[PDB]
């Protein structure tokens, strides 16, 4: 029984832990046996509404409540923002929902790329009344949307067609500088995950570096590290659903953040899905080609790009089936010449 160690890399919030959770759904017991719980969904709900409310005053220009009657709801939300051991009483759900229906709050949500907001904000805020029920058991999709910070390595071990896989994410791990290279030991392939839709956002670590440029810089560092030169990279251009939504909305144009997009044309090898808007096709291949330029500019490793939606179990099932074929057939490239 061959075992393949698969190392998930990528910037924070690109989708690495979601891929692990998807592997567990597909090939282990899902969220059934430190898994994401109801409480994490309530915490995300609270973090979303309190982040949006607090951001209203700080934007330039600032955003006001559309309904000044909701001011006491704002006072409540900000007052419990950092409360340890929040009990989520019924008035919290009342104020959160009523604030989510305030046009000023939504206008602030629409400008979320100007601050730091978790991805699942609208998804959870739109089902406040479902979540607050005492009988509420979260669906797998609820648990996939729930952003939970990993402490330590986040991993899954599973067997498919008599082939063992060990997929692990080191996003929540820290190590001594000279020992970090050891995390790549005996790795069959790196799975590099990119939040394609985050081209208009900046990273939390400094609130200045553009998120996509951060992903390109990370990918460049891995790709050109001579001690990793024999490890092939499977590239997950993730959050395709959020990329399509953002492009079709025209609020943040890609060329406003990556000016060469204005001169980019969709390649002729492109396989746009039927019905895909041409702007979305050009965007997603541009982002792909931003990484492919790095991997072509400089060994015994290749890059295999994939368009993915990490919260879509069926999408990841398909993509991972392609990866297993890529993974089980990577050894064949060792026998090729030139």
């Amino acid at each position: 029984r061959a075992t393949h160690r698969l190392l998930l890399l990528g910037a924070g919030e690109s989708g690495k832990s979601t891929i692990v959770k998807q592997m567990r759904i597909l090939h282990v017991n899902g969220f059934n046996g430190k898994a994401t719980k109801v409480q994490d969904i309530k915490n995300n709900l609270k973090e979303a509404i309190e982040t949006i409310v607090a951001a209203m005053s700080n934007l330039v220009p600032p955003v006001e409540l559309a309904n000044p009657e909701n001011q006491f709801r704002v006072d409540y939300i900000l007052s419990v923002m950092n409360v340890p051991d929040f009990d989520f009483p019924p008035e919290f759900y009342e104020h959160a929902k009523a604030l989510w229906e305030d046009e000023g709050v939504r206008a602030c949500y629409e400008r979320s790329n100007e601050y730091q907001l978790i991805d699942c904000a609208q998804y959870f805020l739109d089902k406040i009344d479902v979540i607050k029920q005492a009988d509420y058991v979260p669906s797998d999709q609820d648990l996939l949307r729930c952003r939970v910070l990993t402490s330590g390595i986040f991993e899954t071990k599973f067997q498919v067609d008599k082939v063992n896989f060990h997929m692990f994410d080191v996003g929540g791990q820290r190590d001594e500088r000279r020992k970090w290279i050891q995390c790549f030991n005996d790795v069959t392939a790196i799975i590099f995950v990119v939040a394609s839709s985050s081209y208009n956002m900046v990273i939390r670590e400094d609130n200045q570096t553009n998120r996509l440029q951060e992903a390109l810089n990370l990918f460049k560092s891995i790709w050109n590290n001579r001690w990793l030169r024999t490890i092939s990279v499977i590239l997950f251009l993730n959050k395709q659903d959020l990329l399509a939504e953002k492009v079709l909305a025209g609020k943040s144009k890609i060329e406003d953040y990556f000016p060469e997009f204005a001169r980019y044309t969709t390649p002729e090898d492109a396989t746009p899905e039927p019905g895909e808007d041409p702007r979305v096709t050009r965007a997603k291949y541009f982002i792909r080609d931003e990484f492919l330029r790095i991997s072509t500019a400089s060994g015994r490793h290749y890059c295999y790009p994939h368009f993915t939606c990490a919260v879509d179990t069926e999408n990841i099932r398909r993509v991972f089936n392609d990866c297993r074929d890529i993974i089980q057939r990577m050894h064949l490239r060792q026998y090729e010449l030139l």
Binding site: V170, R174, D175, E176, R177, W180, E205, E214, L218, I222
Partner: peptide, 15 residues
Amino acid sequence: XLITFRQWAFNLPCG
């Protein structure tokens, strides 16, 4: 002290 992956990847000071 201990550094993150990006501190390693970009040779940033631990801080």
